[PDB]
Design a protein around this ligand. Structure first.
Ligand SMILES: [Mg+2]
Length: 205
């Protein structure tokens, strides 16, 4: 049984490192869907730390605006500029895209040559929700193949790292293994094919 733990909205040297420290503690691989505006010298080392530690990096656009009503040119720029900074610092180039706000359109699908991922959410953008509540939301929703959508970076309180102290041991004890998005597709025998114009919340679709 496989799940993919994924984290939006970073990198942030402070907040992302809290998540990476938990993943090191448990020896767990994950995927970070990063925002191009935030990827710069200052954050180069933490981006590279992701790669170095077996994590995957995907594309969450240049900024924090919904993209569904954007023009082809606007979409193209946002996605390309993000890929370029990721390549510069990480040495990789993304295979997956997570639309801002999970908002899609035919135009968005037509103009992004990446596999679109969504996933199970856990209310972890709501600072009043506790570590235990975030963990309960994940643990009760997962099944074999789930993509779990968390945030490494949000306004605080943001006890998502602490939620991982429950999520990771609980799902391991239930027979799950944690994989990157690329690994999830590969191990399930599903080609990573950006010609698929559908959003994956799990693998297989
Ligand atoms: Mg986001």
């Amino acid at each position: 049984k496989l799940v993919a733990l994924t984290f939006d909205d970073g990198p942030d040297n402070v907040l992302t490192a809290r998540v990476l420290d938990k993943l090191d503690k448990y020896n767990v691989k994950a995927t970070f869907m990063v925002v191009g505006q935030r990827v710069n010298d200052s954050t180069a080392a933490i981006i590279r730390r992701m790669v170095n530690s077996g994590h995957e990096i995907g594309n969450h656009s240049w900024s924090y605006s919904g993209m569904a009503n954007m023009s082809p040119d606007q979409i193209r720029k946002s996605i390309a500029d993000t890929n370029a900074v990721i390549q510069k610092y990480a040495g990789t180039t993304p295979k997956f895209f997570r639309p801002p706000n999970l908002e899609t359109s035919p135009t968005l699908f037509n103009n992004v040559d990446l596999v679109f991922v969504g996933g199970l959410t856990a209310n972890d953008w709501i600072p009043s929700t506790t570590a235990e509540q975030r963990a309960a939301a994940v643990i009760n929703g997962v099944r074999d193949g789930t993509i779990i959508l968390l945030h490494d970076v949000q306004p605080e309180p943001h006890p998502t790292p602490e939620a991982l102290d429950i999520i990771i041991p609980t799902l391991k004890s239930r027979g799950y293994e944690f994989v990157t998005l690329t690994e999830l597709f590969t191990l399930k025998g599903v080609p990573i094919d950006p010609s698929v114009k559908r959003m994956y919340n799990s693998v297989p679709l």
